[PDB]
């Protein structure tokens, strides 16, 4: 019955209320320090020289 | 105002008169001295008819220009657009077999033996005039007479829709009257004129340059006057039916009256001009003065 | 019994929204206040690709980044040459109806699926010389809306019969089905250590999903509408969503909840697809209003704008090295930008 | 500046390209028919009178030298919203609805298809798009009308219990959802199992939507 | 001919 | 007399201006926009593009109209009456060809879809553009400069008669560029407008009939124009080249100008105004504002 | 032959009043 | 059309 499935989709909910989350700001920070530490590397980002850029013209 | 309707009345007066009288004379002169015996005289004698035909239909279509109402009545209105029709086809159709049966003549001389008989040719116009009977049919079928804003109004009256199929008939009307007779006449004389040039009789010298000059210059004339007559009243009656506006200005039915005067023109005084282009014809006046 | 069962889920959800509540001290557009703005990013079309004769749904990048591969209407899927706009191949579908298409890490395979319900495994590296179907793989009740491989053994499909799949190449069967949600699932994404993946669909909720355990273990809400695209970020602790709102939204798996929203007044129309950059800083995002957006992730500025399109930009993608950009679009033409 | 091997790779691609060109000519000529309605409709039966995967079903006909593709959608239970934009390159849209549902209750049967039909007529996808209307199970329904009024469906109607006033009232109040009228003809046609004139209504229907997209594309029309 | 367009 | 020739040069250079600006937008708005998908719109770049060429030709005309005599040089007038003839030739028979799509469009719609694609169309274009050389040849060949009672003139050398075949090329010009086209657009045109009634989205409704009166309008305007602009040119031509009166009367000889710019007119004007006429150029600049 | 068709075209023209 | 005869 559709009961059954309530009984395994409310036990489905109690598994995603039992997780350990973090502060908002250190997952921030830390996308910060990705971006940052990153930011040489990206070749959209940053632009890249004719003759190293592979399509021209 | 006033001068331009009676200066209309006198060019309609001065066509049917002039008209008439000339293909009257034509068929007199044919019926009482050629004796019928060529049959291009027969041909003109039929082309002539249907000219005094249409000539006939004339004095109708003043009375009602000049009265603005129509007081005849519903079947002498079916038996004017009937009459109509029927000699505008029979002249066309008369005119394209008389260039037909030239190109025949000089073309092919061995087969214009057989071809050309006084009794072929006759049966010819017969089957010209009854096939032409199957045009006049309808039209006298469809004719009515409406009263239409305190007025009388001799028409056509068409199926619905009648704008429709009153677009359809002009541009049938237009395609077999104009383009194909032009077309046949046109192949049938240019074809005609490359074979002339091989003659010796018509080449070689000033003289026989100068008749191929008069030779050519009568052929292109028929093409010529077909042309500038026909053309202006069947785009001008396209052009009518295509748009709305009124007919109440009297500049546009003006020149309107002056296309159809131009159509009656070549229906009617263009065979007695044929006729008078015929050397035959001119002989029998030379002899008889 | 089923009221106190549903009682204590509204109960549970309550608690979960409550915790989300005090998580979310601050946001992220005060925290990112101090970085530089990127200033006007000016991408231009570098390469054109004619050829296909009907709309363009789908498209992938490979590992090499040299070889592209692109699903059109037509029934045909083209493997193309970026650099030389050369057509490395031509396969000819058996179903002219093909939502997506993907291409394996090794290069050794492609897969397609479309409304026939089958996805389909063709294999490149055939002695012969021309594409041979591999596999067939049948089973979902719904069409297919997305596929990504995993390995060449493994493949990861979504299906508009609410659920997800795991298919074994060489046995043909459905080893691990994913349930759970009450919409067509529309788009997922892969993370690089491929242990987990997320999912959205019609719902307007986005799921999270364990490969190995067949479990969800995080659901998020708070899109109005459709959610067509899902893409992560490249540390693999956050993704993006587009939906039919007109709003892209970021969400991080650690914090289990919202961190920013982009959005625009003039911008009315739906999202087809998001992708981020190399360095996740700008968010690329197709539009019905035939035009793409180039985003600030960070600052929720949007950065630049690109109008190579005249119908409706379908799907995009950022290759690995990063270098350029392509969009294909319902115009028939996939652009690269860079 | 080009190696030979990259040489035979331009040339590769020119084939492929003479390739996708040819069947692009090809697949250019197909008439595309999208065939809608319920499931107890008579989609089968109309597919078995024009013959003599599992989601969607194409069926390849041809009369008169025309290509004519079929694709019956049927058998999918997905939201239609979401698929419906791939079918909007199609020529004309086949929909199928029987006389009789009004008397089988599930609510009325009738009304379900008039909520079916208004959806697909009034989609913003499908606005040019021509729809061929099939009324199936009509000796059914003549011994039905006779047996049952039709003042239980429709309470507006005071009709007499003739057929074809019956037939003529359903017609009109089916043509009657379309809402853009002047640019989209519907195409009604009574289906019996005797019968084989359907085929050559859909040929006829389908000749008028290509004049029609002809006259659209020199721009006349 | 165009007796039908004057009236 | 002065009046007469500057306001014959204004008209000239008028026709020049508009038509060369007006085949140039037309020209530049096909290829930018449209790209050239649809057949048709293939047919007006390439009527379009014969109207412009036609166009370059008048600057060197009114110059020779106000010098009264040709310093220009034999080779630029080979080139100038070879580029008249070829132009002439290419534009009608690209508009026969519209007309002829148009017709298999419409009353052949399963033969449609083999016949019209735009590589058939570019084919049929390019062998209308190659066949007109073989006209345009002898015209270049037979052009030379000769001087005239103290003044040059360019014109064309025909061999012994030259009156004879001078007037055989009349004729000739005159059926295959007039008679034969009118034929063929007008029983196109004629069979398309009757296959229309059948359709339903043009007939039970008054909406749906205005509809069709428009697309009979439209229809019917290209033949109108065809007949007005090329009738008076061609039959003025022809009395010419029969009649030996004198050129110096300054009336007839602004009269034949008048027949020349209406055949201009038709050539550079009337490509444009097609391209008005069409739907989907107006959708374009509705987009674009 | 061919003057006999001459003639006979000469007087076929004759016959139409042509020439 | 018409010059050869306009000179
Ligand atoms: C409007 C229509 C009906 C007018 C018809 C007029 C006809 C009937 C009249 C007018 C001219 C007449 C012809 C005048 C001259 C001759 C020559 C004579 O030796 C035989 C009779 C004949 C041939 C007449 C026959 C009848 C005739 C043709
Ligand atoms: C209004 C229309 C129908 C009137 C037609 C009148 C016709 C039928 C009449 C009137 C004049 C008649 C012609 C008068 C003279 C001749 C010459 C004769 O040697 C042969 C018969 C012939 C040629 C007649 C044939 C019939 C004829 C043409
Ligand atoms: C100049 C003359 C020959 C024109 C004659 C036109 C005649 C022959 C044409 C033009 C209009 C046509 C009619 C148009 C409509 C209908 C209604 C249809 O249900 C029966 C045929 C019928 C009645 C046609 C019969 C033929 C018709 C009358
Ligand atoms: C004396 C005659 C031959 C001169 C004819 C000049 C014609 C052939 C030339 C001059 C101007 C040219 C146009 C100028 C500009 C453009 C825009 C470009 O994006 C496509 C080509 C296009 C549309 C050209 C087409 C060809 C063109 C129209
Ligand atoms: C004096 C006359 C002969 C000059 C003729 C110039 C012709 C040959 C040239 C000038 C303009 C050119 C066109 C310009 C633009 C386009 C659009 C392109 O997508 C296809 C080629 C096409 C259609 C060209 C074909 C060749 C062309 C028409
Ligand atoms: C050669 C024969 C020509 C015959 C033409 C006759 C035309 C007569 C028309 C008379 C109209 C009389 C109108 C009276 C009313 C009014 O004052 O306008
Ligand atoms: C619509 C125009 C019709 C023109 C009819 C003329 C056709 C003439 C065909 C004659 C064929 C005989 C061979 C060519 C002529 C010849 O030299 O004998
Ligand atoms: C516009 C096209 C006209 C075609 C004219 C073809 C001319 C052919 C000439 C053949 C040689 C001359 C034969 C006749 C010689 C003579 O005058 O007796
Ligand atoms: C009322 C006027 C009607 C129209 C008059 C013009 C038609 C007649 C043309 C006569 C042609 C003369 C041919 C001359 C031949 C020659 O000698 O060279
Ligand atoms: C409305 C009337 C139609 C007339 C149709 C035929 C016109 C032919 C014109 C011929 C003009 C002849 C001028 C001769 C001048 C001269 O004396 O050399
Ligand atoms: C749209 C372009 C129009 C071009 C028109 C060009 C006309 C050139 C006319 C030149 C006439 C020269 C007369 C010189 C008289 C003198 O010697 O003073
Ligand atoms: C606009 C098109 C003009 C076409 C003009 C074609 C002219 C052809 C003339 C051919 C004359 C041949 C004479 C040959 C005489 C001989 O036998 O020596
Ligand atoms: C000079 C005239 C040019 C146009 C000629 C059109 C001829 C069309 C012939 C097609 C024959 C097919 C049967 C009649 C048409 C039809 O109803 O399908
Ligand atoms: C000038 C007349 C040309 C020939 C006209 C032929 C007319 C035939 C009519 C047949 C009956 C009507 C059939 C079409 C009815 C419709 O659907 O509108
Ligand atoms: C400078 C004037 C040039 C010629 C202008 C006339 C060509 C334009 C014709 C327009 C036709 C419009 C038809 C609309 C019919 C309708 O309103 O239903
Ligand atoms: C020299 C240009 C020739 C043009 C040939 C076609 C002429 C068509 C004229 C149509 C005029 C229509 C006027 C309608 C006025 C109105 O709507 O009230
Ligand atoms: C509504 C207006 C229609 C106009 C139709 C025009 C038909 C051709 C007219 C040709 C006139 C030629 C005049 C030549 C005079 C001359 O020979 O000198």
Same mark, same amino acid.
């Given at each position: 019955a559709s009961i059954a499935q309530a009984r395994k989709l409310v036990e489905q909910l109690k598994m995603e209320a039992n997780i350990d989350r973090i502060k908002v700001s250190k997952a921030a920070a830390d996308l910060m320090a990705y971006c940052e530490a990153h930011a040489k590397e990206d070749p959209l980002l940053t632009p890249v020289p004719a003759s190293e850029n592979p399509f021209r013209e | 105002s006033?001068?331009?309707?009676?200066?209309?009345?006198?060019?309609?007066?001065?066509?049917?008169?002039?008209?008439?009288?000339?293909?009257? !004379?034509?068929?007199?002169?044919?019926?009482? +001295?050629?004796? $019928?015996?060529?049959?291009?005289?027969?041909?003109?004698?039929?082309?002539?008819?249907?000219?005094?035909?249409?000539?006939?239909?004339?004095?109708?279509?003043?009375?009602?220009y000049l009265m603005e109402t129509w007081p005849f009545?519903?079947?002498?209105?079916?038996?004017?657009?009937?009459?109509?029709?029927?000699?505008?086809?029979?002249?066309?159709?008369? !005119?394209?077999?008389?260039?037909?049966?030239?190109?025949?003549?000089?073309?092919? #001389?061995?087969?214009?033996?057989?071809? &050309?008989?006084?009794?072929?040719?006759?049966?010819?116009?017969?089957?010209?005039?009854?096939?032409?009977?199957?045009?006049?049919?309808?039209?006298?079928? $469809?004719?009515?007479? %409406?009263? &239409?804003?305190?007025?009388?109004?001799?028409?056509?009256?068409?199926?619905?829709?009648?704008? +429709?199929?009153?677009?359809?008939?002009?541009?049938?009307?237009?395609?077999?009257?104009?383009?194909? #007779?032009?077309?046949?006449?046109?192949?049938? +004389?240019?074809?005609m004129l490359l074979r002339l040039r091989s003659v010796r009789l018509?080449?070689?010298?000033?003289?026989?340059?100068?008749?191929?000059?008069?030779?050519?210059?009568?052929?292109?004339?028929?093409?010529?006057?077909?042309?500038?007559?026909?053309?202006?009243?069947?785009?001008?009656?396209?052009?009518?039916?295509?748009?709305?506006?009124? %007919?109440?200005?009297?500049?546009?039915v003006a020149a309107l009256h002056l296309?159809?005067?131009?159509?009656?023109?070549?229906?009617?005084?263009?065979?007695?001009? +044929?006729?008078?282009?015929?050397?035959?014809?001119?002989?029998?006046?030379?002899?008889?003065? | 019994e089923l009221d106190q069962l549903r009682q204590e889920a509204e109960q549970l959800k309550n608690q979960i /929204?409550?915790?989300?509540?005090?998580?979310?001290?601050?946001?992220?557009?005060?925290?990112?206040?101090?970085?530089?703005?990127?200033?006007?990013?000016?991408? /231009?079309?570098?390469?054109?690709?004619?050829?296909?004769?009907?709309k363009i749904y789908a498209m992938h990048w490979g590992t090499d980044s040299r070889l592209l591969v692109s699903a059109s209407q037509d029934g045909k899927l083209i493997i193309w040459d970026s650099y030389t706009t050369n057509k490395v191949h031509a396969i000819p579908l058996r179903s002219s109806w093909v939502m997506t298409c993907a291409y394996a890490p090794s290069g050794n395979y492609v897969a397609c699926g479309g409304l026939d319900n089958?996805?389909?495994?063709?294999?490149?590296?055939?002695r012969e010389?021309?594409?041979?179907?591999? /596999?067939?793989?049948?089973?979902?009740?719904?069409?297919?809306?997305?596929?990504?491989?995993?390995?060449?053994?493994?493949?990861?499909?979504?299906?508009?019969?609410?659920?997800?799949?795991?298919?074994?190449?060489?046995?043909?069967?459905?080893?691990?089905?994913?349930?759970?949600?009450?919409?067509?699932?529309?788009?997922?994404?892969?993370?690089?250590?491929?242990?987990?993946?997320?999912?959205?669909?019609?719902?307007?909720?986005?799921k999270l999903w364990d490969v190995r355990e067949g479990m969800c273990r995080q659901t998020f809400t708070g899109h109005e509408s459709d959610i067509n695209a899902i893409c992560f970020f490249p540390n693999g602790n956050a993704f993006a969503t587009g939906s039919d709102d007109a709003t892209c939204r970021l969400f991080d798996l650690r914090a289990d909840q919202e961190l920013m929203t982009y959005s625009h007044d003039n911008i009315i129309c739906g999202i087809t697809s998001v992708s981020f950059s190399k360095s996740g800083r700008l968010l690329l995002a197709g539009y019905d209003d035939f035009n793409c957006n180039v985003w600030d992730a960070l600052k929720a500025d949007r950065a630049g704008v690109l109008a190579g399109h005249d119908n409706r930009v379908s799907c995009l993608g950022v290759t690995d090295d990063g270098m350029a950009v392509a969009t294909g679009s319902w115009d028939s033409f996939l652009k690269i930008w860079n | 500046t080009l190696s030979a091997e990259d040489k035979a790779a331009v040339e590769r691609s020119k084939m492929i390209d003479r390739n996708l060109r040819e069947d692009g000519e090809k697949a250019a000529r197909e008439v595309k028919l999208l065939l809608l309605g319920a499931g107890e409709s008579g989609k089968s039966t109309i597919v078995k009178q024009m013959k003599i995967t599992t989601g969607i079903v194409e069926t390849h006909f041809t009369f008169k030298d025309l290509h004519f593709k079929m694709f019956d959608v049927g058998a999918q239970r997905s939201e239609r919203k979401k698929w419906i934009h791939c079918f909007e390159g199609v020529?004309?849209?086949?929909?199928?609805?029987?006389?009789?549902?009004?008397?089988?209750?599930?609510?009325?049967?009738?009304?379900?298809?008039?909520?079916?039909?208004?959806?697909?007529?009034?989609?913003?996808?499908?606005?040019?798009?021509?729809?061929?209307?099939?009324?199936?199970?009509?000796?059914?329904?003549?011994?039905?009308?006779?047996?049952?009024?039709?003042?239980?469906?429709?309470?507006?109607?005071?009709?007499?219990?003739?057929?074809?006033?019956?037939?003529?009232?359903?017609?009109?109040?089916?043509?009657?959802?379309?809402?853009?009228?002047?640019?989209?003809?519907?195409?009604?046609?009574?289906?019996?199992?005797?019968?084989?004139?359907?085929?050559?209504?859909?040929?006829?229907?389908?000749?008028?939507?290509?004049?029609?997209?002809?006259?659209?594309?020199?721009?006349?029309? | 001919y165009x007796f039908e367009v004057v009236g």
């Open positions: - | 006033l001068a331009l309707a009676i200066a209309i009345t006198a060019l309609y007066s001065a066509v049917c008169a002039v008209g008439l009288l000339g293909n009257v !004379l034509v068929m007199f002169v044919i019926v009482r +001295y050629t004796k $019928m015996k060529t049959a291009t005289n027969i041909y003109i004698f039929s082309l002539a008819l249907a000219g005094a035909l249409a000539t006939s239909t004339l004095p109708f279509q003043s009375a009602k009545g519903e079947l002498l209105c079916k038996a004017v657009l009937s009459i109509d029709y029927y000699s505008m086809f029979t002249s066309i159709f008369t !005119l394209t077999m008389m260039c037909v049966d030239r190109y025949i003549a000089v073309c092919h #001389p061995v087969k214009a033996l057989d071809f &050309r008989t006084p009794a072929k040719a006759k049966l010819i116009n017969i089957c010209i005039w009854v096939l032409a009977s199957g045009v006049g049919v309808p039209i006298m079928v $469809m004719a009515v007479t %409406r009263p &239409r804003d305190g007025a009388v109004v001799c028409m056509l009256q068409f199926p619905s829709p009648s704008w +429709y199929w009153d677009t359809v008939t002009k541009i049938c009307v237009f395609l077999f009257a104009f383009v194909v #007779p032009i077309l046949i006449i046109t192949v049938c +004389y240019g074809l018509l080449s070689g010298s000033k003289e026989k340059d100068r008749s191929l000059r008069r030779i050519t210059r009568m052929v292109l004339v028929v093409v010529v006057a077909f042309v500038v007559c026909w053309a202006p009243i069947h785009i001008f009656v396209i052009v009518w039916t295509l748009v709305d506006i009124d %007919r109440r200005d009297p500049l546009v296309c159809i005067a131009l159509g009656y023109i070549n229906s009617s005084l263009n065979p007695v001009l +044929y006729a008078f282009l015929d050397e035959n014809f001119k002989r029998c006046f030379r002899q008889l003065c | /929204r409550d915790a989300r509540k005090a998580c979310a001290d601050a946001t992220l557009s005060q925290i990112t206040n101090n970085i530089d703005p990127v200033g006007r990013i000016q991408m /231009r079309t570098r390469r054109t690709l004619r050829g296909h004769l009907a089958i996805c389909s495994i063709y294999n490149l590296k055939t010389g021309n594409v041979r179907v591999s /596999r067939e793989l049948a089973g979902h009740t719904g069409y297919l809306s997305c596929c990504r491989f995993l390995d060449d053994n493994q493949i990861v499909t979504s299906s508009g019969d609410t659920t997800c799949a795991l298919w074994d190449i060489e046995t043909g069967q459905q080893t691990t089905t994913f349930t759970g949600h009450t919409g067509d699932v529309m788009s997922l994404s892969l993370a690089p250590d491929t242990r987990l993946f997320v999912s959205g669909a019609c719902d307007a909720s986005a | 020529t004309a849209i086949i929909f199928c609805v029987a006389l009789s549902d009004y008397d089988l209750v599930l609510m009325n049967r009738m009304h379900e298809s008039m909520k079916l039909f208004d959806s697909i007529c009034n989609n913003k996808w499908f606005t040019d798009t021509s729809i061929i209307l099939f009324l199936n199970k009509k000796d059914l329904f003549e011994e039905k009308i006779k047996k049952s009024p039709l003042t239980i469906c429709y309470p507006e109607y005071a009709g007499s219990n003739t057929y074809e006033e019956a037939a003529a009232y359903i017609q009109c109040q089916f043509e009657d959802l379309n809402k853009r009228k002047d640019t989209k003809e519907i195409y009604t046609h009574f289906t019996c199992s005797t019968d084989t004139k359907n085929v050559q209504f859909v040929f006829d229907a389908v000749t008028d939507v290509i004049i029609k997209n002809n006259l659209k594309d020199c721009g006349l029309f | -």
